[PDB]
Design an enzyme around this catalytic site. Structure first.
Site, PDB file in Angstrom:
ATOM      1  N   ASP A   1       0.954  -1.215  -0.005  1.00 18.15           N
ATOM      2  CA  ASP A   1       0.016  -0.035   0.009  1.00 18.15           C
ATOM      3  C   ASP A   1       0.905   1.027   0.109  1.00 18.15           C
ATOM      4  OD1 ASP A   1      -2.235   1.601   0.293  1.00 18.15           O
ATOM      5  OD2 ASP A   1      -3.223   0.124   1.580  1.00 18.15           O
TER       6      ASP A   1
ATOM      7  N   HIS B   1      -4.146   6.076   3.321  1.00 16.74           N
ATOM      8  CA  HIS B   1      -4.979   4.763   2.695  1.00 16.74           C
ATOM      9  C   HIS B   1      -4.409   3.774   3.474  1.00 16.74           C
ATOM     10  CE1 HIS B   1      -5.606   1.928  -0.343  1.00 16.74           C
ATOM     11  NE2 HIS B   1      -6.478   2.466  -0.432  1.00 16.74           N
TER      12      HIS B   1
ATOM     13  N   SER C   1     -10.999  -1.585  -1.431  1.00 17.29           N
ATOM     14  CA  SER C   1     -10.159  -2.183  -0.601  1.00 17.29           C
ATOM     15  C   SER C   1     -10.559  -2.461   0.817  1.00 17.29           C
ATOM     16  CB  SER C   1      -8.970  -1.120  -0.462  1.00 17.29           C
ATOM     17  OG  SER C   1      -8.158  -0.967  -1.762  1.00 17.29           O
TER      18      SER C   1
END
Ligand code: CA
Lengths: 92, 476, 10
Positions: B24, B57, B217
């Site tokens: 990520d 994120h 996700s």
């Protein structure tokens, strides 16, 4: 026998960098040799190349930064299974 | 006090040797939710850009997976690789290198079962799919985002990689997330859905902040945490066993399918992930083909995973101009092949794929006369019936019309008991196996059938005087 | 904050 692939979504393409994937049984020593072979051949044509990474463990092959003009040359290299142009991935 | 999403996945009865890798953005590894349980790896490969943004994120997702307060698998050891830059962009090649990195760390310092969360997507990539497949063959469990484009997941990678668990997003109303032209991807490459809208988790804004984010996700992170816990309880599960159990323990038919495009509705599994409730049972899943082209000789194929057995084979086309299906050997495996007909827009092949070791299986055919075949012994059981024809217009025994060839799936499994259940009456006729039993085969008795397919444990036959036939088994 | 633009392409 060796095929070439680039991403079908044009804006996500990243031309100039290519993942060269060798046939399955290919040993790491051959992968590196083949990368050096391609480099040699491209130099005899006044193209500059940079081998960014040599893959072994999951897939044999290497990451190369080079002009697309060399793709036909690259596809003739011994052991080549297929070549894929790099492309983008995004946070989901 | 309990976030809707953590509640949504809790089963009707409930109460660290596993590692979850995360590829990520950067991670605020010392946020309260995950502090001490996330190891930042020394791997980084990101494209160049063109500090709170940079790790937002990845931080939220690590939180969803393993967070102390708002996480799915609260006691989860994690490892992060940085493959997305601060704008959340990566390369196929940088990802490959990361996946390669995981296998290398595994070879040099093995631990226990590994789960790899891949919260990213690009277009169909051949090489990225291939890498995922090898990493799966090596014994690793991959979980990926279906993608956020309200489109077919088979067009995205790693979503399209077949060996990886691909996860779509549902909302608090259990419906597929939609937003304008965007939202959860859908279709046959999606294995299941999970909560993916309005998801609370660690915010990189400060050490103790939480934020609500949304995406496939987030849906995928839920499945990775559920998988982490399934593997803590039973570490010897293979991927194939793990996938079947996720499907089995999901909530069924809570999604209103009208949210999907018409031709994806039958393809898209109606499943919202859940933790399993907390000796041996028969697990099966249904695998759909892509739609074949409209040419006469066009055919579609559906395949099972390597350790699964193909127990039955059906077909479907919404016009009904099709020529049925047949099980044929291909590369050592049974495969299910469906046939289009003249004027037909194309057909689907539909496989029932099960985990049945201790078993050998073969197909028995009789050509046209109606026509019959059977499994000619005892403790050897009929699990499926297929039928195809060249024209255009009974325990242990299959029967079909006289102008059609017919095929029986015969299995050696003396631990298995099977029963055939019928029902008839008219757009649709369905019959379901009783609780504890597993649907292995679904077909229609020879009016005009569009087709038949298994949906979980219910045999569905679509028509335009029609009877559905279900074969149902269980261990004894 | 719902669909943060941190997610592509929300
Ligand atoms: Ca898949």
């Amino acid at each position: 026998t060796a095929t070439f692939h680039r991403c079908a979504k044009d804006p996500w393409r990243l031309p100039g960098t290519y993942v060269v994937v060798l046939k399955e049984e290919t040993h790491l020593s051959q992968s590196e040799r083949t990368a050096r072979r391609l480099q040699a051949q491209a130099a005899r044509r006044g193209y500059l190349t940079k081998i960014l990474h040599v893959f072994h463990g999951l897939l044999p092959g290497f990451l190369v930064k080079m002009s697309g003009d060399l793709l036909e040359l690259a596809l003739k290299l011994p052991h080549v299974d297929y070549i894929e142009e790099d492309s983008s991935v995004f946070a989901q | 006090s309990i976030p809707w999403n953590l509640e949504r996945i809790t089963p009707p009865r409930y109460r660290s040797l596993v590692e979850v890798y995360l590829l990520d953005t950067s991670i605020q590894s010392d946020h309260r939710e995950i502090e001490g349980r996330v190891m930042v790896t020394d791997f980084e490969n990101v494209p160049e850009e063109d500090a709170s943004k940079c790790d937002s994120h990845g931080t939220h997702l690590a939180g969803v997976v393993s967070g102390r307060d708002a996480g799915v698998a609260k006691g989860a050891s994690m490892r992060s690789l940085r493959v997305l830059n601060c704008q959340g962009k990566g390369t196929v090649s940088g990802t490959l290198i990361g996946l390669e990195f995981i296998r290398k760390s595994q070879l040099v310092q093995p631990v226990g079962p590994l789960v790899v969360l891949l919260p990213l997507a690009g277009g169909y990539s051949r090489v990225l799919n291939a890498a995922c497949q090898r990493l799966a063959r090596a014994g690793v469990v991959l979980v990926t985002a279906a993608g956020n484009f309200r489109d077919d997941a088979c067009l995205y990678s790693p979503a399209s990689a077949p060996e990886v668990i691909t996860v779509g997003a549902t909302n608090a109303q259990d419906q597929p997330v939609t937003l304008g032209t965007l939202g959860t991807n859908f279709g046959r490459c999606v294995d299941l859905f999970a909560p993916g809208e309005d998801i609370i988790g660690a915010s990189s804004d400060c050490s103790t902040c939480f934020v609500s984010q949304s995406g496939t996700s987030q849906a995928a992170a839920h499945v990775a945490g559920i998988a982490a816990m399934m593997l803590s309880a039973e570490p010897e599960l293979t991927l194939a066993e793990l996938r079947q159990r996720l499907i089995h323990f999901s909530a069924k038919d809570v999604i209103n399918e009208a949210w999907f495009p018409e031709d994806q509705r039958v393809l898209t599994p109606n499943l919202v992930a859940a933790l399993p409730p907390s000796g041996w049972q028969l697990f099966c899943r249904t695998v759909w083909s892509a739609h074949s082209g409209p040419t006469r000789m066009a055919t579609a194929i559906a395949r099972c995973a390597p350790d699964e057995e193909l127990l039955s084979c059906s077909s479907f086309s919404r016009s009904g101009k099709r020529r049925g299906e047949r099980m044929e050997a291909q590369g050592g495996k049974l495969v299910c092949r469906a046939h289009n007909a003249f004027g037909g827009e194309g057909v689907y092949a539909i496989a029932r794929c099960c985990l049945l070791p201790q078993a050998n299986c073969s197909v028995h055919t009789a050509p046209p006369a109606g026509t019959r075949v059977h499994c000619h012994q005892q403790g050897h059981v009929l699990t499926g019936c297929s039928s195809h024809w060249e024209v255009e217009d009974q325990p242990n025994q299959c029967v079909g019309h006289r102008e059609a060839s017919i095929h029986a799936s015969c299995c050696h499994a003396p631990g298995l008991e099977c029963k055939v259940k019928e029902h008839g009456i008219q757009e649709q006729v369905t019959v379901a196996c009783e609780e504890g039993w597993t649907l292995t085969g679904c077909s229609a008795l020879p009016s005009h059938v569009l087709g038949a397919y298994a949906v979980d444990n219910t045999c569905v036959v679509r028509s335009r005087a029609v009877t559905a036939v279900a074969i149902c088994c269980r261990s004894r | 904050x719902x669909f943060e633009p941190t997610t592509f392409a929300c």
